[PDB]
Design a protein around this nucleic acid. Structure first.
Ligand SMILES: [Mg+2]
Ligand SMILES: [Mg+2]
Ligand SMILES: [Mg+2]
Ligand SMILES: [Mg+2]
Ligand SMILES: [Mg+2]
Ligand SMILES: [Mg+2]
Ligand SMILES: [Mg+2]
Ligand SMILES: [Mg+2]
Ligand SMILES: [Mg+2]
Ligand SMILES: [Mg+2]
Ligand SMILES: [Mg+2]
Ligand SMILES: [Mg+2]
Ligand SMILES: [Mg+2]
Ligand SMILES: [Mg+2]
Ligand SMILES: [Mg+2]
Ligand SMILES: [Mg+2]
Ligand SMILES: [Mg+2]
Ligand SMILES: [Mg+2]
Ligand SMILES: [Mg+2]
Ligand SMILES: [Mg+2]
Ligand SMILES: [Mg+2]
Ligand SMILES: [Mg+2]
Ligand SMILES: [Mg+2]
Ligand SMILES: [Mg+2]
Ligand SMILES: [Mg+2]
Ligand SMILES: [Mg+2]
Ligand SMILES: [Mg+2]
Ligand SMILES: [Mg+2]
Ligand SMILES: [Mg+2]
Ligand SMILES: [Mg+2]
Ligand SMILES: [Mg+2]
Ligand SMILES: [Mg+2]
Ligand SMILES: [Mg+2]
Ligand SMILES: [Mg+2]
Ligand SMILES: [Mg+2]
Ligand SMILES: [Mg+2]
Ligand SMILES: [Mg+2]
Ligand SMILES: [Mg+2]
Ligand SMILES: [Mg+2]
Ligand SMILES: [Mg+2]
Ligand SMILES: [Mg+2]
Ligand SMILES: [Mg+2]
Ligand SMILES: [Mg+2]
Ligand SMILES: [Mg+2]
Ligand SMILES: [Mg+2]
Ligand SMILES: [Mg+2]
Ligand SMILES: [Mg+2]
Ligand SMILES: [Mg+2]
Ligand SMILES: [Mg+2]
Ligand SMILES: [Mg+2]
Ligand SMILES: [Mg+2]
Ligand SMILES: [Mg+2]
Ligand SMILES: [Mg+2]
Ligand SMILES: [Mg+2]
Ligand SMILES: [Mg+2]
Ligand SMILES: [Mg+2]
Ligand SMILES: [Mg+2]
Ligand SMILES: [Mg+2]
Ligand SMILES: [Mg+2]
Ligand SMILES: [Mg+2]
Ligand SMILES: [Mg+2]
Ligand SMILES: [Mg+2]
Ligand SMILES: [Mg+2]
Ligand SMILES: [Mg+2]
Ligand SMILES: [Mg+2]
Ligand SMILES: [Mg+2]
Ligand SMILES: [Mg+2]
Ligand SMILES: [Mg+2]
Ligand SMILES: [Mg+2]
Ligand SMILES: [Mg+2]
Ligand SMILES: [Mg+2]
Ligand SMILES: [Mg+2]
Ligand SMILES: [Mg+2]
Ligand SMILES: [Mg+2]
Ligand SMILES: [Mg+2]
Ligand SMILES: [Mg+2]
Ligand SMILES: [Mg+2]
Ligand SMILES: [Mg+2]
Ligand SMILES: [Mg+2]
Ligand SMILES: [Mg+2]
Ligand SMILES: [Mg+2]
Ligand SMILES: [Mg+2]
Ligand SMILES: [Mg+2]
Ligand SMILES: [Mg+2]
Ligand SMILES: [Mg+2]
Ligand SMILES: [Mg+2]
Ligand SMILES: [Mg+2]
Ligand SMILES: [Mg+2]
Ligand SMILES: [Mg+2]
Ligand SMILES: [Mg+2]
Ligand SMILES: [Mg+2]
Ligand SMILES: [Mg+2]
Ligand SMILES: [Mg+2]
Ligand SMILES: [Mg+2]
Ligand SMILES: [Mg+2]
Ligand SMILES: [Mg+2]
Ligand SMILES: [Mg+2]
Ligand SMILES: [Mg+2]
Ligand SMILES: [Mg+2]
Ligand SMILES: [Mg+2]
Ligand SMILES: [Mg+2]
Ligand SMILES: [Mg+2]
Ligand SMILES: [Mg+2]
Ligand SMILES: [Mg+2]
Ligand SMILES: [Mg+2]
Ligand SMILES: [Mg+2]
Ligand SMILES: [Mg+2]
Ligand SMILES: [Mg+2]
Ligand SMILES: [Mg+2]
Ligand SMILES: [Mg+2]
Ligand SMILES: [Mg+2]
Ligand SMILES: [Mg+2]
Ligand SMILES: [Mg+2]
Ligand SMILES: [Mg+2]
Ligand SMILES: [Mg+2]
Ligand SMILES: [Mg+2]
Ligand SMILES: [Mg+2]
Ligand SMILES: [Mg+2]
Ligand SMILES: [Mg+2]
Ligand SMILES: [Mg+2]
Ligand SMILES: [Mg+2]
Ligand SMILES: [Mg+2]
Ligand SMILES: [Mg+2]
Ligand SMILES: [Mg+2]
Ligand SMILES: [Mg+2]
Ligand SMILES: [Mg+2]
Ligand SMILES: [Mg+2]
Ligand SMILES: [Mg+2]
Ligand SMILES: [Mg+2]
Ligand SMILES: [Mg+2]
Ligand SMILES: [Mg+2]
Ligand SMILES: [Mg+2]
Ligand SMILES: [Mg+2]
Ligand SMILES: [Mg+2]
Ligand SMILES: [Mg+2]
Ligand SMILES: [Mg+2]
Ligand SMILES: [Mg+2]
Ligand SMILES: [Mg+2]
Ligand SMILES: [Mg+2]
Ligand SMILES: [Mg+2]
Ligand SMILES: [Mg+2]
Ligand SMILES: [Mg+2]
Ligand SMILES: [Mg+2]
Ligand SMILES: [Mg+2]
Ligand SMILES: [Mg+2]
Ligand SMILES: [Mg+2]
Ligand SMILES: [Mg+2]
Ligand SMILES: [Mg+2]
Ligand SMILES: [Mg+2]
Ligand SMILES: [Mg+2]
Ligand SMILES: [Mg+2]
Ligand SMILES: [Mg+2]
Ligand SMILES: [Mg+2]
Ligand SMILES: [Mg+2]
Ligand SMILES: [Mg+2]
Ligand SMILES: [Mg+2]
Ligand SMILES: [Mg+2]
Ligand SMILES: [Mg+2]
Ligand SMILES: [Mg+2]
Ligand SMILES: [Mg+2]
Ligand SMILES: [Mg+2]
Ligand SMILES: [Mg+2]
Ligand SMILES: [Mg+2]
Ligand SMILES: [Mg+2]
Ligand SMILES: [Mg+2]
Ligand SMILES: [Mg+2]
Ligand SMILES: [Mg+2]
Ligand SMILES: [Mg+2]
Ligand SMILES: [Mg+2]
Ligand SMILES: [Mg+2]
Ligand SMILES: [Mg+2]
Ligand SMILES: [Mg+2]
Ligand SMILES: [Mg+2]
Ligand SMILES: [Mg+2]
Ligand SMILES: [Mg+2]
Ligand SMILES: [Mg+2]
Ligand SMILES: [Mg+2]
Ligand SMILES: [Mg+2]
Ligand SMILES: [Mg+2]
Ligand SMILES: [Mg+2]
Ligand SMILES: [Mg+2]
Ligand SMILES: [Mg+2]
Ligand SMILES: [Mg+2]
Ligand SMILES: [Mg+2]
Ligand SMILES: [Mg+2]
Ligand SMILES: [Mg+2]
Ligand SMILES: [Mg+2]
Ligand SMILES: [Mg+2]
Ligand SMILES: [Mg+2]
Ligand SMILES: [Mg+2]
Ligand SMILES: [Mg+2]
Ligand SMILES: [Mg+2]
Ligand SMILES: [Mg+2]
Ligand SMILES: [Mg+2]
Ligand SMILES: [Mg+2]
Ligand SMILES: [Mg+2]
Ligand SMILES: [Mg+2]
Ligand SMILES: [Mg+2]
Ligand SMILES: [Mg+2]
Ligand SMILES: [Mg+2]
Ligand SMILES: [Mg+2]
Ligand SMILES: [Mg+2]
Ligand SMILES: [Mg+2]
Ligand SMILES: [Mg+2]
Ligand SMILES: [Mg+2]
Ligand SMILES: [Mg+2]
Ligand SMILES: [Mg+2]
Lengths: 134, 59, 76, 98, 187
RNA sequence: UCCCCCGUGCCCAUAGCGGCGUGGAACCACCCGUUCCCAUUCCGAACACGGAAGUGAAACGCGCCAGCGCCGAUGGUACUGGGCGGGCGACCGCCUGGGAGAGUAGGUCGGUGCGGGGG
RNA sequence: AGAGCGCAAGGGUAGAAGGGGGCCUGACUGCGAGGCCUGCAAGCCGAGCAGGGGCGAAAGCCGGGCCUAGUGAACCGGUGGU
RNA sequence: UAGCUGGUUCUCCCCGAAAUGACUUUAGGGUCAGCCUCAGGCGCUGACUGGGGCCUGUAGAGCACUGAUAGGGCUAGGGGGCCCACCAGCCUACCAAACCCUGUCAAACUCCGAAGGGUCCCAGGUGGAGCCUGGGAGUGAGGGCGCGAGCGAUAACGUCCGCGUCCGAGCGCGGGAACAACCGAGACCGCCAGCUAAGGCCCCCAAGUCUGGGCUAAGUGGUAAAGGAUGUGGCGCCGCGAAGACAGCCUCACUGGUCGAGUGGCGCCGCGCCGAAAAUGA
């Protein structure tokens, strides 16, 4: 990264934009609940997949943690939390596509993605690639 | 544009100031109170505004 | 915490809208730059303040590549 | 380069627009705010001789004739892209006599 | 593929969706009209037709038209179609996307690797008469790191690409791997 | 009343970029010359004056093509005055009135006022 | 127009507010319709009249600086004048 | 002396706040403004609504600017595969500027941009409306709730603003077991009359153990999550089969066997199940 400074928090209005469509792989993991996903979550989820199908096809991360996360040092009530203890996270509304795999079969893709579900602080659903392309 | 019979059938207690005014605009003060006003774009406006607490009919 | 600081907010903006009567000298718009330009019977001061040059009604106009203008079409 | 045109406008009225060709020169008083011409004393493309400046002062007085007859007086001179001098100046020299 | 349609009007678009009918519109430079179709029927058809294969719409007007699915607005939050467009063809060369067939195992994929098929289909300007069910591409010469472009396609008769000639169609790329995590763990 | 050109204003890219073609009678430009007026941080490039020969190459005017640019619905959705209902919540759904952005279909090598000159 | 506009950011701006040159000192005097802002006090904009001037052929422009910071009631005293 | 605490005595009638802004050796105090009240004057103007004009940059969306951004392509600078070093390009499971395609992000980014909000004109609006002049004030700890944001930890009966509401002053009335602000509703007095609101109609306790149709077998209901499961109904698609299919007859497949006609896999919905440990008696 590089950018500039610490962010305000902001609410997570309806899943409006938060949502996409598979666009890189044969299968996709998609969010159902809204939430800030920590970087360290992305990581664990990602590795959980590669760790699974060793020497596997290709992983596609489609959300990037660009939001600065703040936190107070265990004190009272003034200044703004230097924080960053979790560092950064990416806002994720329901329907947003998180990960996509490719170069692997059903069982490889199903299992691997499913594992990511357990790494994520969200209820999630796997997706094929229906036939819907705009 | 005949006429409108309006009846306040739900207390404005807890409703916005403006809606309270809208009633005073119509001439409704007491509850369950009858009130017939000539159908006009200026009157219907305030009637449509308190719609949820009054009930109308045509006369 | 080098922040927590600001500056007395200047109440600026369009001070008289289209279809309003104005006396000569009335301020029409207090603005940062020339977000509005002068025009028929409307001069502006060193700060960009657009003001009426004569009495009349105020009417706005837009001209794309040429910008927006405030006027005072008189009649009295 | 027509910045001068803008100045003259937001100032008064009755623009003495003055075009001039390599072998010609034209002048027309126009009341803007609606975009209409009051009088048009064309020159080389009308009848006049051969000396540009000598021609200019003629048309200048010429414009004044027809113009001032209709009752005119705002000498708001549209010194076009041309520097005020010689031909354009003589054109003025003319109206400044008629 | 043919599919029954019906004319729509002031009917609340939302209301239709309860009844399992999904609204839509058919149009071309000549005419457009409100419509809708049975969702499940459309689903089953669009599952193969998408926007590549043609689609005949049976209106109660007895009319049957050579429509193409122009776009399908999806409802985010549990993907699912809201509303469908239908570009009723004519005869002039109307452009459109055409599917692809990357046949043959790449030099890279066989020798460990993975093919990332970029475009699964290519936009092309073609007459309605020529609806090439697909276009062939010999993706066998692609060793890892290699990449094919539009300027390298088996363009069929009467067909011509309407995208960029220098656009990329697909490419082979390195495979995810655990050994890479050891090196990534170091940095 | 109709066509062409010249000066000028209005709309302010559907007026633009590019590509091809066309006009020199008139108009305009280009052009000839540097003595006079005027001019170059140097140069008559520019501004300026006196003007024939040449040209329509440049510029400009007119006319074509939709590659870029530009304009762009309908339909649907977002969002939302106001009125309601559901969960612990991050939130969610209905009624009612309003209703985008994006994208699709398509449009576009302009329109027009005044004055002057030429047929 | 992503530069520039003395400095922070912003708004504005090449149809100049930016860059260069000629002449000049209105970084005038006496006023000031009408307003912006506003609890008070302050702060800000200003056409126009008179006087005497600057630049321009003229229409005109000039009561400092593209604008928004660069500041201090009263009290007490210094200084020059009437 | 006390800018602090306490105390301040008869009745009825009318109206009825504030807990905000500015400045304050000011911060639990004051001064001016706001909000209440009385008198006089003005007289349709007032809140609210209709129509019309202008102003605006939020919700949403977008990448055109400022930046951020994954993958790929393409290509200056790093390392080179075939090596070639006093040189080279397609290209390398190598680090990357610019640019292009795919795909995204932003309070301090906007090519766009609502709903709405403000103001003016015309119209309706006679109301404890409105305006002007004065006399008298109190208030300047607010609080809860809804909504929009900041802070906080998408903690707090948290805190700080914005719009609204109610409590304050309606701890008067009905409901919510009990409970300032949640639902209903603004109590002048009387009545052993009537109608409804919210909420209810098995008993405590007024009113149907009402009618018609489903679901639940947990006391769920009687208030917990990720997650897990041949719980149970409803819906849908995909595989086998009387060419005999599914189990078990070592069998699954399959034919003679035979019950022979159903069977296996997945997905969506309603209600439930597990996950589920606390201190006086439930
Ligand atoms: Mg699922
Ligand atoms: Mg695409
Ligand atoms: Mg897209
Ligand atoms: Mg209430
Ligand atoms: Mg109220
Ligand atoms: Mg009563
Ligand atoms: Mg009565
Ligand atoms: Mg700072
Ligand atoms: Mg501050
Ligand atoms: Mg502030
Ligand atoms: Mg004013
Ligand atoms: Mg001035
Ligand atoms: Mg200035
Ligand atoms: Mg207008
Ligand atoms: Mg322009
Ligand atoms: Mg000219
Ligand atoms: Mg005739
Ligand atoms: Mg004739
Ligand atoms: Mg005519
Ligand atoms: Mg004609
Ligand atoms: Mg013309
Ligand atoms: Mg005009
Ligand atoms: Mg060019
Ligand atoms: Mg030619
Ligand atoms: Mg020719
Ligand atoms: Mg010739
Ligand atoms: Mg010669
Ligand atoms: Mg000589
Ligand atoms: Mg000499
Ligand atoms: Mg120089
Ligand atoms: Mg010199
Ligand atoms: Mg020369
Ligand atoms: Mg010249
Ligand atoms: Mg000549
Ligand atoms: Mg010639
Ligand atoms: Mg030419
Ligand atoms: Mg040429
Ligand atoms: Mg043309
Ligand atoms: Mg043209
Ligand atoms: Mg073309
Ligand atoms: Mg195109
Ligand atoms: Mg329509
Ligand atoms: Mg629409
Ligand atoms: Mg609609
Ligand atoms: Mg709504
Ligand atoms: Mg519940
Ligand atoms: Mg939680
Ligand atoms: Mg809530
Ligand atoms: Mg509607
Ligand atoms: Mg519309
Ligand atoms: Mg709109
Ligand atoms: Mg879009
Ligand atoms: Mg896009
Ligand atoms: Mg469409
Ligand atoms: Mg052209
Ligand atoms: Mg056009
Ligand atoms: Mg046309
Ligand atoms: Mg047109
Ligand atoms: Mg005309
Ligand atoms: Mg004519
Ligand atoms: Mg002519
Ligand atoms: Mg003739
Ligand atoms: Mg003829
Ligand atoms: Mg640019
Ligand atoms: Mg700039
Ligand atoms: Mg500079
Ligand atoms: Mg900056
Ligand atoms: Mg700036
Ligand atoms: Mg400008
Ligand atoms: Mg300048
Ligand atoms: Mg300079
Ligand atoms: Mg200068
Ligand atoms: Mg100088
Ligand atoms: Mg100078
Ligand atoms: Mg010098
Ligand atoms: Mg006076
Ligand atoms: Mg005054
Ligand atoms: Mg004053
Ligand atoms: Mg004011
Ligand atoms: Mg004041
Ligand atoms: Mg005071
Ligand atoms: Mg004062
Ligand atoms: Mg100041
Ligand atoms: Mg003055
Ligand atoms: Mg003078
Ligand atoms: Mg003169
Ligand atoms: Mg002045
Ligand atoms: Mg000045
Ligand atoms: Mg300066
Ligand atoms: Mg200056
Ligand atoms: Mg100070
Ligand atoms: Mg100081
Ligand atoms: Mg000071
Ligand atoms: Mg002092
Ligand atoms: Mg003192
Ligand atoms: Mg003294
Ligand atoms: Mg003294
Ligand atoms: Mg005191
Ligand atoms: Mg005491
Ligand atoms: Mg009493
Ligand atoms: Mg009494
Ligand atoms: Mg009493
Ligand atoms: Mg009283
Ligand atoms: Mg307070
Ligand atoms: Mg202050
Ligand atoms: Mg003060
Ligand atoms: Mg105080
Ligand atoms: Mg005190
Ligand atoms: Mg007071
Ligand atoms: Mg108040
Ligand atoms: Mg009296
Ligand atoms: Mg009267
Ligand atoms: Mg009235
Ligand atoms: Mg209105
Ligand atoms: Mg309106
Ligand atoms: Mg309307
Ligand atoms: Mg905007
Ligand atoms: Mg905001
Ligand atoms: Mg947003
Ligand atoms: Mg983008
Ligand atoms: Mg960008
Ligand atoms: Mg931009
Ligand atoms: Mg920016
Ligand atoms: Mg960028
Ligand atoms: Mg990616
Ligand atoms: Mg990248
Ligand atoms: Mg990479
Ligand atoms: Mg790469
Ligand atoms: Mg090498
Ligand atoms: Mg080596
Ligand atoms: Mg070596
Ligand atoms: Mg060697
Ligand atoms: Mg060498
Ligand atoms: Mg060497
Ligand atoms: Mg060497
Ligand atoms: Mg060497
Ligand atoms: Mg050697
Ligand atoms: Mg060597
Ligand atoms: Mg690069
Ligand atoms: Mg990379
Ligand atoms: Mg780039
Ligand atoms: Mg924010
Ligand atoms: Mg910033
Ligand atoms: Mg914008
Ligand atoms: Mg648009
Ligand atoms: Mg709007
Ligand atoms: Mg609006
Ligand atoms: Mg309005
Ligand atoms: Mg009036
Ligand atoms: Mg009225
Ligand atoms: Mg009355
Ligand atoms: Mg009264
Ligand atoms: Mg009252
Ligand atoms: Mg009251
Ligand atoms: Mg009044
Ligand atoms: Mg007063
Ligand atoms: Mg008073
Ligand atoms: Mg008083
Ligand atoms: Mg007081
Ligand atoms: Mg206060
Ligand atoms: Mg407090
Ligand atoms: Mg306080
Ligand atoms: Mg309060
Ligand atoms: Mg409150
Ligand atoms: Mg609150
Ligand atoms: Mg709320
Ligand atoms: Mg926000
Ligand atoms: Mg949040
Ligand atoms: Mg909590
Ligand atoms: Mg909070
Ligand atoms: Mg706020
Ligand atoms: Mg109350
Ligand atoms: Mg009580
Ligand atoms: Mg008590
Ligand atoms: Mg109770
Ligand atoms: Mg109660
Ligand atoms: Mg209470
Ligand atoms: Mg209460
Ligand atoms: Mg009551
Ligand atoms: Mg009583
Ligand atoms: Mg009673
Ligand atoms: Mg009795
Ligand atoms: Mg009743
Ligand atoms: Mg009844
Ligand atoms: Mg019962
Ligand atoms: Mg009991
Ligand atoms: Mg009973
Ligand atoms: Mg029962
Ligand atoms: Mg039953
Ligand atoms: Mg149990
Ligand atoms: Mg618990
Ligand atoms: Mg449970
Ligand atoms: Mg929980
Ligand atoms: Mg949770
Ligand atoms: Mg749950
Ligand atoms: Mg659960
Ligand atoms: Mg499961
Ligand atoms: Mg069970
Ligand atoms: Mg079932
Ligand atoms: Mg089997
Ligand atoms: Mg066998
Ligand atoms: Mg059998
Ligand atoms: Mg299966
Ligand atoms: Mg499903
Ligand atoms: Mg249990
Ligand atoms: Mg136990
Ligand atoms: Mg216990």
């Amino acid at each position: 990264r590089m950018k500039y400074r610490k962010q305000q928090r902001g609410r997570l209005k309806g899943a409006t934009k938060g949502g996409d469509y598979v666009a890189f792989g044969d299968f996709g993991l998609v969010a159902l609940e809204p939430a800030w996903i920590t970087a360290q979550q992305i990581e664990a989820a990602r590795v959980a997949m590669v760790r699974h199908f060793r020497r596997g096809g290709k992983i596609f991360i489609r959300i990037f943690p660009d939001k600065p996360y703040t936190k107070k040092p265990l004190e009272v009530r003034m200044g703004k939390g230097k924080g960053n203890v979790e560092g950064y996270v990416a806002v994720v509304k329901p329907g947003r596509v998180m990960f996509e795999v490719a170069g692997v079969t059903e069982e490889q893709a199903m299992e691997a993605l499913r594992i990511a579900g357990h790494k994520l602080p969200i209820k999630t659903k796997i997706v094929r690639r229906d036939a819907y392309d705009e | 544009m005949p006429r409108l019979k309006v009846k306040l059938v739900k207390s404005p207690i807890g409703y916005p100031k403006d809606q309270k005014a809208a009633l005073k605009a119509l001439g409704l003060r007491r509850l369950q109170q009858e009130r017939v006003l000539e159908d006009t774009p200026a009157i219907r406006g305030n009637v449509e505004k308190v719609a949820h607490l009054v009930r109308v009919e045509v006369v | 915490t080098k922040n927590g600081r600001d500056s007395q907010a200047k109440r600026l903006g369009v001070k008289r809208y289209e279809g309003q009567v104005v006396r000569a000298g009335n301020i029409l718009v207090r603005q940062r730059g020339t977000r509005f330009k002068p025009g028929k019977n409307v001069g502006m001061g060193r700060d960009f303040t657009l003001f009426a040059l004569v009495d009349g009604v105020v009417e706005f106009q837009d001209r794309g590549r040429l910008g927006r203008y405030v006027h005072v079409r008189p009649l009295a | 380069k027509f910045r001068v045109r803008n100045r003259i406008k937001r100032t008064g009225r009755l623009r003495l627009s003055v075009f001039r060709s390599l072998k010609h020169i034209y002048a027309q008083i126009i009341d803007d705010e609606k975009g209409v011409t009051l009088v048009s004393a064309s020159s080389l493309a009308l009848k006049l001789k051969g000396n540009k400046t000598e021609v200019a002062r003629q048309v200048g007085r010429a414009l004044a004739e027809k113009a001032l007859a209709l009752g005119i007086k705002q000498v708001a001179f549209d010194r076009g892209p041309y520097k005020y001098h010689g031909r354009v100046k003589a054109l003025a020299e003319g109206a400044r006599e008629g | 593929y043919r599919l029954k349609a019906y004319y729509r009007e002031g009917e609340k678009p939302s209301a239709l969706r309860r009844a399992g009918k999904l609204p839509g519109v058919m149009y071309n430079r000549h005419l457009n009209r409100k419509v809708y179709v049975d969702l499940v029927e459309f689903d089953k058809v669009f599952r193969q037709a998408s926007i590549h294969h043609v689609i005949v719409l049976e209106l109660p007007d007895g009319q049957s038209l050579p429509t193409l699915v122009r776009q399908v607005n999806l409802d985010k939050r549990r993907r699912r179609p809201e509303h469908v467009d239908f570009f009723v063809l004519s005869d002039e060369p109307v452009e459109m996307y055409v599917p692809l067939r990357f046949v043959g195992t790449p030099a890279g994929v066989r020798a460990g690797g993975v093919l990332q098929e970029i475009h699964r289909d290519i936009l092309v300007k073609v007459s309605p008469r020529n609806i090439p069910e697909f276009i062939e591409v010999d993706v066998s010469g692609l060793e890892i790191g290699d990449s094919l472009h539009a300027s390298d396609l088996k363009l069929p008769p009467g067909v011509e690409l309407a995208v960029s000639p220098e656009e990329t169609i697909a490419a082979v790329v390195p495979p995810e791997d655990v050994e890479k995590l050891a090196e990534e763990a170091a940095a």
